[PDB]
Amino acid sequence: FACKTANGTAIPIGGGSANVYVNLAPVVNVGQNLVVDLSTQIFCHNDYPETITDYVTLQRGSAYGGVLSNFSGTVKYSGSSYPFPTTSETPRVVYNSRTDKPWPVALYLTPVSSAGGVAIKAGSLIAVLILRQTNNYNSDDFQFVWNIYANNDVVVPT
């Protein structure tokens, strides 16, 4: 089991970490969602589907900088919604193919009432998402750490 980003940055068997640079909607009004869809950014696969089933969860999702200060978050994992920053490990997603499958994580961020102006700064860390991988074969328990960065400023109109 290993993962890669849309630009080809890989995290090999055993886990590790990688940076993910995301383009964000430049203008987000109070009452609207800023959607950060990681399913177009992070892809994973099973290296031995003939014998092994891989189990994948979002173990933790943490908010940073402007996302932590200016937004009220929700994380959607494989069609179910949870608070973001996270309060528990999600259920598992099964990886049973050698063909790349997107990691089904999306952040839904709505401005808090005090937000206004430059709510997210270009180049800042916005989130850290922990992908946890286990299997039905051995004792492997690996973490694939995704450091999410904003490519641009996000303005919340006043």
Ligand X SMILES: CCCCCCCO[C@H]1O[C@H](CO)[C@@H](F)[C@H](O)[C@@H]1O
**Contact residues for ligand X, defined by CB under 6 A:** 1, 13, 46-48, 52, 54, 135, 137, 140
Read off the DSSP letter of residue 38. Answer: G
Q: Among residues 32 and 48, whose Cβ is nearest to ligand X?
A: 48
User: What is the smallest separation between the CB atom of 145 and ligand X, expressed in angstroms?
Assistant: 16
Residue with tokens 């996000």: 154
User: What is the smallest separation between the CB atom of 79 and ligand X, expressed in angstroms?
Assistant: 23
C-beta separation of 20 from 149 below 8 A: yes
User: What is the smallest separation between the CB atom of 11 and ligand X, expressed in angstroms?
Assistant: 11
Distance in angstroms (rounded) separating the CA atoms of residues 24 and 95: 29
Q: Among residues 15 and 111, whose Cβ is nearest to ligand X?
A: 15
Q: Among residues 69 and 137, whose Cβ is nearest to ligand X?
A: 137
Say if residue 127 is exposed, middle or buried (CB neighbours under 10 Å; 0-12, 13-18, 19+): buried
